[PDB]
Amino acid sequence: VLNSESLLRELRDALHEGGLTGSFLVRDLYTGEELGIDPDTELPTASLVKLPLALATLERIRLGEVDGAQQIEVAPGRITTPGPTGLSRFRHPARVAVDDLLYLSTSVSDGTASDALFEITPPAQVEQMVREWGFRDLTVRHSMRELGTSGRGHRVPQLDVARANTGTARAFVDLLEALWAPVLTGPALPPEPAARLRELMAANLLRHRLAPDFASDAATWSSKTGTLLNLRHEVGVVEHADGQVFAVAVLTESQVPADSQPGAEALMAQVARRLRDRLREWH
Amino acid sequence: NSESLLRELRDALHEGGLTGSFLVRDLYTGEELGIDPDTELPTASLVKLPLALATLERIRLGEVDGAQQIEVAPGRITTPGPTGLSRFRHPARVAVDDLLYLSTSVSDGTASDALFEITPPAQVEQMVREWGFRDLTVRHSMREHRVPQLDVARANTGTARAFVDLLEALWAPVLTGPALPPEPAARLRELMAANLLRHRLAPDFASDAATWSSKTGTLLNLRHEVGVVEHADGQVFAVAVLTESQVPADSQPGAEALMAQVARRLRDRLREWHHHH
């Protein structure tokens, strides 16, 4: 059995080997114990931004500022290239309620749905609410279709951490902890919006990244993926049948050009799983 | 030849608590390798494939308007599994073309129910039979043996061969070298390419040098996926996997990896024979 210093070295070696850099953090939501690799490195968040958008929207609903039943006439994305989902691929206008736009945006990763929600609650207003709740290191700057590893001043706007929506693994772990706190027993988001976001994350349809390594008959996995250019992320919470609960955040960028990298997915998933397993084995 | 490979894959399936119908076919050469490819199983969400085809043919004929806006009652489902309109809380208005996307690519049961109101199960089955497809039954919609859904007498059924034959016909218009209407076929290949449920066979078939277009089916202890892999070098294989598990757990990503590995190894053997024999 490896010691934890040796394990982290093995994991970093494995990531380097597979052409991946990024930000990993796993935390036992009960004890606060955690294990990570570069957990405070800021990367563009791609579709992970849909999480704080959902929470802001849900809070505005609780507040009576937004009506979840409000029917919105949404123009089709008409996108025919690979990747975007839901209304983004529609050919014709659709009419969808705000509550159901939240489902499409958060669970189906539908950027056209997300953009409809951003019209209601703009990026700067989402960010303000996130900051007011005390969340640091999550930026919300632009909607889904506004806009050499990522970096400050990047030529590619979506890879420029000064312009793009960004975050760190730690920022997402802190968010997930706050979302799950109302159901964590034993010795501060409003509980109704938190419960609704947990439900949306459980209903996530994109289960091809970390979910094969985290979901089982004895574990539930609720998560949000993000994929754009050479970015592949996923943040989520695994709930074990024995009651253990871990938040997991993976943000990666690949030095391999190919969009389709199932081996990279398997690798980042194995890394996250080994981090969780070490904490789970930890006395 | 491949007797050894087939025993090895049958062993793996037995050990993993899976039985079913597997078939992989090289769409150019016609060579195929299977495990019980003629065994009838309930098809679950796979029925959305013939439904889409039948609908798309009706659009071509002017019988159905892809632009027609449908007012859809929400599924209001909160338990795990169903997707799209099935999980909506409120009514929504969606065009036929976009219900085809939801049903086929998102596996949305409520969207497929709306499509079945337009082109009902027996009409789909009739259209499929008239095109010459056998061993695909279409009897009920999503929201319609001692378990009803596992009863091959009542349920929508199919065999791996049935699906492989359907996939072959859908891809035929783009297969070069020495019959479905091409527009409906093209639209369905596109819907299949846009499938979102990429957690089953997709990790084993999609790569930088291979595209994977498919449809999954999941119900009770049934776990299926049928699809086509297109290699960067021009090879094309149709893949059909229909399984039922003896293990009662709904969540079995090990079973999913197992069935994907079986299908991939069948393809690999055909790909090797194509290249090297």
XYZ file of C-alpha atoms in Angstrom:
560
model
C 0.000 0.000 0.000
C 1.277 3.467 -1.008
C 1.589 6.334 1.469
C -0.422 9.487 0.522
C 2.617 11.452 -0.651
C 3.612 8.507 -2.894
C 0.028 8.124 -4.121
C -0.225 11.771 -5.157
C 3.068 11.367 -7.030
C 1.775 8.288 -8.859
C -1.440 10.140 -9.773
C 0.412 13.209 -11.072
C 2.708 10.908 -13.064
C -0.342 9.149 -14.544
C -1.928 12.496 -15.502
C 1.277 13.732 -17.130
C 1.555 10.430 -19.052
C -1.997 10.816 -20.402
C -1.479 14.434 -21.499
C -3.654 15.987 -18.756
C -3.141 18.935 -16.424
C -5.742 20.429 -14.072
C -7.302 20.673 -10.675
C -8.614 17.749 -8.539
C -10.060 17.748 -5.064
C -12.031 15.175 -3.091
C -13.505 15.963 0.340
C -15.319 13.855 2.937
C -18.288 16.181 3.541
C -18.659 14.947 7.134
C -15.101 15.169 8.444
C -13.803 17.870 6.053
C -10.788 15.681 5.284
C -9.562 16.145 1.728
C -7.031 15.059 -0.859
C -6.219 17.003 -3.988
C -3.932 17.812 -6.889
C -3.503 21.550 -7.657
C -7.001 22.242 -6.162
C -6.641 26.059 -6.333
C -5.668 26.419 -9.998
C -8.143 28.566 -11.922
C -9.515 27.148 -15.221
C -12.333 28.149 -17.572
C -15.411 26.244 -16.335
C -17.370 25.719 -19.556
C -20.709 24.085 -18.698
C -19.949 23.969 -14.927
C -21.141 27.589 -14.859
C -24.674 26.135 -15.181
C -24.453 25.154 -11.518
C -24.193 28.650 -10.027
C -26.751 29.850 -12.649
C -29.208 27.221 -11.393
C -28.652 28.095 -7.727
C -29.110 31.838 -8.395
C -32.245 31.146 -10.436
C -33.675 28.838 -7.720
C -33.064 31.410 -5.013
C -34.811 34.086 -7.100
C -37.726 31.662 -7.416
C -37.821 31.156 -3.614
C -37.723 34.955 -3.260
C -40.739 35.372 -5.571
C -38.636 37.432 -7.981
C -38.898 34.739 -10.691
C -41.883 32.518 -11.492
C -40.923 28.898 -12.140
C -44.227 28.371 -14.024
C -43.551 31.282 -16.402
C -43.658 30.049 -20.013
C -40.778 31.326 -22.113
C -40.813 31.356 -25.925
C -37.303 30.108 -26.855
C -35.713 30.541 -30.296
C -34.079 27.330 -31.582
C -30.289 26.888 -31.463
C -30.311 25.154 -34.864
C -26.856 23.758 -34.051
C -25.787 20.805 -36.208
C -22.152 20.428 -35.088
C -21.208 18.004 -32.297
C -21.585 18.817 -28.625
C -24.492 21.187 -27.733
C -27.756 19.649 -26.478
C -31.494 20.206 -25.957
C -32.907 23.456 -27.341
C -29.428 24.156 -28.780
C -30.207 21.532 -31.460
C -33.882 22.434 -31.990
C -35.005 23.424 -35.489
C -38.145 25.354 -34.412
C -39.266 27.675 -31.544
C -40.329 25.923 -28.355
C -42.281 27.197 -25.344
C -40.870 25.993 -22.013
C -41.396 26.983 -18.392
C -38.565 28.444 -16.308
C -38.619 25.363 -13.975
C -38.158 23.135 -16.997
C -35.512 25.407 -18.526
C -33.619 24.764 -15.253
C -33.907 21.003 -15.918
C -32.701 21.383 -19.504
C -29.771 23.689 -18.544
C -28.586 21.830 -15.448
C -29.400 18.169 -16.203
C -29.218 18.045 -20.021
C -26.435 20.692 -20.258
C -28.543 22.684 -22.751
C -26.765 25.959 -23.506
C -29.803 27.509 -25.276
C -31.802 26.786 -22.144
C -28.962 28.289 -20.049
C -28.964 31.423 -22.201
C -32.720 31.832 -21.650
C -32.026 31.664 -17.897
C -29.181 34.186 -18.197
C -31.630 36.628 -19.872
C -33.679 36.423 -16.665
C -30.694 36.505 -14.273
C -27.591 37.984 -16.044
C -24.006 36.644 -15.412
C -23.088 39.633 -13.203
C -26.219 39.119 -11.061
C -25.473 35.378 -10.687
C -21.899 36.227 -9.662
C -23.112 38.804 -7.141
C -25.390 36.223 -5.478
C -22.533 33.660 -5.465
C -20.218 36.200 -3.851
C -22.898 37.230 -1.321
C -23.183 33.629 -0.203
C -19.483 33.732 0.486
C -18.387 31.656 -2.473
C -14.944 32.605 -3.651
C -13.180 31.762 -6.886
C -16.249 31.182 -9.033
C -16.611 33.804 -11.713
C -19.749 34.280 -13.794
C -18.979 36.657 -16.620
C -20.736 35.577 -19.797
C -23.469 33.350 -21.143
C -22.818 30.067 -22.970
C -22.209 31.393 -26.434
C -20.424 34.663 -25.883
C -16.661 34.286 -26.626
C -1.084 26.700 -25.267
C -2.937 25.697 -22.071
C -5.501 28.174 -20.637
C -4.038 31.274 -19.034
C -4.411 34.987 -18.318
C -4.592 36.841 -21.647
C -5.111 33.728 -23.776
C -5.600 34.450 -27.516
C -8.623 32.095 -27.455
C -11.240 33.944 -25.397
C -12.775 30.689 -24.017
C -9.317 29.742 -22.659
C -8.548 33.185 -21.219
C -8.983 32.983 -17.449
C -9.300 36.815 -17.343
C -12.398 36.766 -19.624
C -14.023 33.294 -19.457
C -16.205 31.974 -16.693
C -13.673 30.360 -14.292
C -13.321 28.389 -11.056
C -11.097 25.979 -9.140
C -11.711 22.432 -7.876
C -11.862 23.893 -4.338
C -14.415 26.475 -5.374
C -16.687 23.672 -6.674
C -16.051 21.430 -3.657
C -17.079 24.358 -1.376
C -20.255 24.882 -3.447
C -21.157 21.158 -3.355
C -20.556 21.053 0.409
C -22.930 23.972 0.884
C -25.528 22.280 -1.415
C -25.405 19.043 0.587
C -25.040 20.578 4.122
C -28.823 20.606 4.724
C -28.904 16.800 4.557
C -25.571 16.191 6.332
C -26.407 15.016 9.869
C -24.386 15.338 13.037
C -22.531 18.245 14.589
C -25.383 28.456 4.509
C -27.730 28.065 1.526
C -31.526 28.152 1.833
C -32.632 24.504 1.933
C -35.343 24.571 -0.778
C -33.077 25.858 -3.607
C -30.294 23.493 -2.414
C -32.653 20.480 -2.526
C -33.821 21.403 -6.008
C -30.213 21.694 -7.265
C -29.284 18.330 -5.691
C -32.279 16.834 -7.568
C -31.175 18.417 -10.886
C -27.640 17.088 -10.400
C -28.976 13.609 -9.645
C -30.919 13.762 -12.942
C -27.760 14.637 -14.962
C -27.862 12.746 -18.292
C -24.172 13.011 -19.136
C -22.889 9.934 -17.340
C -19.890 8.981 -19.477
C -17.037 10.648 -17.539
C -16.772 10.055 -13.761
C -20.125 8.294 -13.326
C -18.901 4.800 -14.414
C -16.273 4.913 -11.651
C -18.535 6.403 -8.944
C -22.051 5.019 -9.488
C -22.918 1.477 -8.345
C -25.614 -0.504 -6.517
C -24.031 0.883 -3.309
C -23.344 4.473 -4.391
C -25.295 7.300 -5.968
C -23.525 9.890 -8.140
C -24.994 13.380 -8.816
C -22.887 15.690 -10.998
C -22.340 18.348 -13.699
C -19.904 17.823 -16.562
C -18.266 20.509 -18.684
C -16.661 20.003 -22.069
C -15.284 22.621 -24.438
C -12.210 22.696 -26.688
C -9.578 20.730 -24.689
C -11.411 21.185 -21.381
C -13.071 18.176 -19.664
C -14.490 18.708 -16.226
C -16.869 17.129 -13.822
C -17.974 18.040 -10.295
C -20.272 15.934 -8.173
C -21.145 14.157 -4.965
C -20.955 10.440 -4.346
C -23.327 9.125 -1.660
C -22.401 5.677 -0.385
C -24.950 3.180 0.861
C -23.104 3.159 4.213
C -23.674 6.898 4.612
C -20.296 8.302 3.564
C -20.546 11.363 1.289
C -17.703 12.854 -0.789
C -17.634 15.895 -3.016
C -15.400 15.392 -6.062
C -14.151 18.121 -8.417
C -12.112 17.438 -11.547
C -11.102 20.178 -13.966
C -8.740 19.194 -16.746
C -7.148 20.441 -19.909
C -5.503 18.156 -22.425
C -2.307 18.652 -24.467
C -3.699 16.100 -26.979
C -5.664 17.864 -29.796
C -8.424 15.193 -30.259
C -11.982 16.068 -29.118
C -12.831 12.407 -28.595
C -10.636 11.044 -25.750
C -12.333 8.158 -23.894
C -8.925 7.111 -22.436
C -8.474 10.616 -20.952
C -11.971 10.291 -19.446
C -11.122 6.907 -17.962
C -7.858 8.336 -16.560
C -9.285 11.441 -14.880
C -12.031 9.209 -13.466
C -9.501 6.681 -12.088
C -7.554 9.534 -10.487
C -10.657 10.945 -8.779
C -11.692 7.440 -7.692
C -8.243 6.690 -6.150
C -8.324 10.003 -4.225
C -11.789 9.138 -2.843
C -10.693 5.544 -2.072
C -7.736 6.806 -0.031
C -10.008 9.038 2.086
C -12.545 6.224 2.416
C -9.723 3.887 3.630
C -8.389 6.649 5.912
C -9.109 5.311 9.457
C -11.723 -19.187 -36.550
C -13.541 -17.469 -33.661
C -15.055 -20.307 -31.605
C -12.496 -19.589 -28.850
C -13.354 -15.895 -28.802
C -17.068 -16.636 -28.570
C -16.556 -19.056 -25.620
C -14.422 -16.509 -23.857
C -17.069 -13.822 -24.295
C -19.855 -16.182 -23.221
C -17.809 -16.996 -20.075
C -17.445 -13.286 -19.253
C -21.163 -12.721 -19.740
C -22.054 -15.698 -17.512
C -19.637 -14.522 -14.802
C -21.119 -11.012 -14.982
C -24.695 -12.347 -14.639
C -25.752 -11.334 -18.164
C -27.626 -13.186 -20.922
C -28.746 -11.701 -24.242
C -28.362 -11.306 -27.982
C -25.160 -9.842 -29.516
C -24.371 -9.244 -33.181
C -21.611 -7.278 -34.937
C -21.529 -7.012 -38.734
C -19.009 -5.502 -41.142
C -21.361 -3.469 -43.325
C -19.207 -3.742 -46.428
C -18.154 -7.340 -46.331
C -21.285 -8.755 -44.555
C -19.113 -10.865 -42.249
C -20.585 -11.041 -38.766
C -19.972 -12.522 -35.326
C -22.655 -12.972 -32.715
C -23.820 -14.536 -29.495
C -27.400 -15.798 -29.730
C -28.181 -13.041 -32.322
C -31.706 -14.388 -33.011
C -32.937 -14.385 -29.395
C -36.066 -12.260 -28.844
C -35.954 -9.774 -25.927
C -38.192 -6.807 -25.009
C -36.604 -3.768 -26.642
C -37.411 -0.971 -24.134
C -36.262 2.424 -25.537
C -34.894 0.821 -28.758
C -38.447 1.009 -30.171
C -37.777 4.764 -30.540
C -35.644 3.856 -33.587
C -38.381 2.363 -35.818
C -40.700 5.098 -34.508
C -38.303 7.817 -35.716
C -37.863 6.136 -39.084
C -41.587 5.727 -39.622
C -42.201 9.353 -38.568
C -39.439 10.640 -40.898
C -40.909 8.645 -43.791
C -44.339 10.207 -43.077
C -42.710 13.655 -43.112
C -41.196 12.826 -46.554
C -44.672 11.752 -47.759
C -46.301 14.996 -46.543
C -48.460 13.009 -44.056
C -46.771 14.651 -41.065
C -45.504 18.233 -40.826
C -42.139 18.386 -39.038
C -42.924 22.044 -38.191
C -46.277 21.197 -36.467
C -46.197 22.516 -32.893
C -47.435 20.024 -30.302
C -48.716 21.004 -26.876
C -47.166 18.371 -24.597
C -48.418 17.551 -21.103
C -45.503 17.171 -18.653
C -44.358 13.745 -17.490
C -43.789 15.032 -13.919
C -41.552 11.983 -13.241
C -39.230 12.355 -10.244
C -37.921 8.800 -9.946
C -34.621 7.845 -11.690
C -34.447 7.057 -15.410
C -36.918 8.958 -17.654
C -35.509 12.067 -19.476
C -36.590 15.298 -21.187
C -40.329 16.049 -21.281
C -40.786 13.016 -19.009
C -39.275 15.099 -16.131
C -40.951 18.444 -17.021
C -43.193 20.025 -14.339
C -45.177 22.148 -16.796
C -46.737 21.965 -20.260
C -44.405 22.674 -23.161
C -44.873 23.362 -26.869
C -42.455 21.542 -29.192
C -42.415 20.894 -32.941
C -42.550 17.379 -34.426
C -38.926 17.640 -35.733
C -37.784 18.572 -32.211
C -39.813 15.780 -30.559
C -37.885 13.464 -32.924
C -34.686 14.854 -31.430
C -35.932 14.471 -27.831
C -37.283 10.941 -28.396
C -34.405 9.587 -30.461
C -31.357 11.431 -29.178
C -32.376 12.183 -25.582
C -34.483 8.970 -25.142
C -37.415 11.086 -23.901
C -40.371 8.768 -23.210
C -42.922 11.570 -23.131
C -41.708 12.873 -26.493
C -41.895 9.397 -27.950
C -45.496 9.062 -26.562
C -46.427 12.268 -28.407
C -44.900 10.857 -31.616
C -46.861 7.591 -31.094
C -50.062 9.649 -30.942
C -49.192 10.873 -34.442
C -47.943 7.532 -35.878
C -49.291 4.721 -33.649
C -47.499 1.461 -32.778
C -49.255 -0.752 -35.395
C -48.552 1.774 -38.203
C -44.864 1.881 -37.268
C -44.785 -1.942 -37.273
C -46.591 -2.028 -40.636
C -44.126 0.461 -42.192
C -41.157 -1.527 -40.859
C -42.578 -4.808 -42.142
C -43.290 -3.278 -45.574
C -39.652 -2.217 -45.887
C -38.848 -5.906 -45.350
C -37.682 -5.795 -41.747
C -38.513 -8.834 -39.752
C -38.402 -9.635 -36.027
C -39.146 -6.094 -34.829
C -42.475 -5.769 -33.087
C -44.040 -2.448 -32.240
C -47.094 -2.829 -30.016
C -47.073 -0.171 -27.312
C -45.734 3.228 -26.305
C -43.417 3.885 -23.326
C -46.177 4.903 -20.945
C -48.288 1.810 -21.810
C -43.625 -13.757 -18.567
C -45.057 -12.718 -15.161
C -43.701 -9.154 -15.470
C -45.609 -7.185 -18.181
C -42.535 -5.296 -19.509
C -40.492 -8.543 -19.618
C -43.286 -10.436 -21.442
C -42.134 -11.122 -25.046
C -45.832 -11.733 -25.897
C -46.982 -8.214 -24.909
C -43.864 -5.998 -25.017
C -42.095 -4.431 -28.016
C -39.518 -7.073 -29.020
C -36.540 -7.508 -31.338
C -33.354 -9.541 -31.732
C -29.788 -8.306 -32.277
C -30.064 -9.456 -35.918
C -33.266 -7.399 -36.399
C -31.472 -4.238 -35.305
C -28.298 -4.977 -37.251
C -30.443 -5.388 -40.399
C -32.154 -2.042 -39.678
C -28.815 -0.292 -39.093
C -27.388 -1.773 -42.274
C -30.332 -0.326 -44.257
C -29.993 3.081 -42.567
C -26.286 3.310 -43.514
C -26.604 1.669 -46.952
C -26.974 5.042 -48.767
C -23.480 6.115 -47.666
C -21.773 2.740 -48.194
C -19.692 2.930 -51.338
C -18.744 0.187 -53.784
C -20.784 -2.593 -55.447
C -33.876 -0.014 -49.487
C -34.796 2.982 -47.327
C -35.565 6.461 -48.711
C -32.244 8.371 -48.333
C -33.553 11.577 -46.690
C -35.332 9.803 -43.809
C -32.268 7.512 -43.459
C -29.904 10.564 -43.353
C -32.022 12.300 -40.729
C -32.012 9.200 -38.528
C -28.216 8.708 -38.812
C -27.978 12.366 -37.629
C -30.287 11.775 -34.684
C -28.286 8.700 -33.718
C -25.017 10.672 -33.966
C -26.550 13.198 -31.569
C -27.394 10.524 -28.924
C -26.601 11.891 -25.441
C -26.559 8.632 -23.479
C -22.892 7.804 -24.073
C -22.168 5.865 -20.891
C -22.674 2.319 -22.179
C -20.960 1.245 -25.428
C -19.766 4.719 -26.394
C -16.607 4.777 -24.206
C -15.422 1.581 -25.986
C -16.294 2.646 -29.546
C -15.833 6.407 -29.821
C -12.280 7.690 -30.343
C -10.313 10.250 -32.308
C -10.329 7.685 -35.151
C -13.892 6.372 -34.790
C -17.392 7.908 -34.585
C -20.188 6.130 -32.668
C -23.905 6.688 -33.406
C -26.373 4.734 -31.280
C -29.539 4.254 -29.257
C -29.623 2.725 -25.764
C -32.543 0.970 -24.014
C -32.882 0.542 -20.263
C -35.808 -0.932 -18.395
C -35.888 -3.028 -15.239
C -33.088 -5.624 -15.766
C -32.752 -4.970 -19.526
C -29.779 -3.016 -20.896
C -29.394 -2.631 -24.650
C -27.542 -0.501 -27.164
C -27.520 -0.646 -30.944
C -25.376 1.498 -33.167
C -22.862 1.972 -35.891
C -19.121 2.663 -35.544
C -17.442 4.499 -38.428
C -13.658 4.222 -38.529
C -11.366 6.911 -39.828
C -10.007 4.352 -42.363
C -13.474 3.739 -43.865
C -14.539 0.576 -42.054
C -18.120 0.578 -40.769
C -19.654 -1.935 -38.325
C -23.212 -2.336 -37.084
C -23.424 -3.363 -33.415
C -26.454 -4.692 -31.510
C -26.422 -5.627 -27.858
C -29.561 -6.710 -25.968
C -29.037 -7.984 -22.469
C -30.891 -9.018 -19.398
C -29.249 -9.307 -16.014
C -29.710 -11.956 -13.318
C -28.458 -9.388 -10.794
C -31.377 -7.337 -9.458
C -29.452 -3.979 -9.044
C -30.542 -1.128 -11.389
C -27.105 0.472 -11.199
C -24.477 -1.857 -12.760
C -21.733 0.080 -14.496
C -19.658 -3.149 -14.353
C -22.372 -4.853 -16.432
C -22.270 -1.907 -18.825
C -18.461 -2.139 -19.196
C -18.792 -5.922 -19.663
C -21.356 -5.732 -22.466
C -19.332 -2.946 -24.124
C -16.164 -5.022 -23.937
C -17.985 -8.013 -25.508
C -19.252 -5.888 -28.407
C -15.861 -4.231 -28.892
C -14.040 -7.589 -28.977
C -16.489 -8.942 -31.565
C -15.845 -5.822 -33.736
C -12.070 -6.086 -33.224
C -12.016 -9.694 -34.425
C -13.955 -8.727 -37.578
C -11.753 -5.651 -38.071
C -8.606 -7.822 -37.770
C -9.970 -10.347 -40.313
C -10.897 -7.543 -42.695
C -7.419 -5.995 -42.459
C -5.276 -9.110 -42.366
C -7.124 -11.984 -44.074
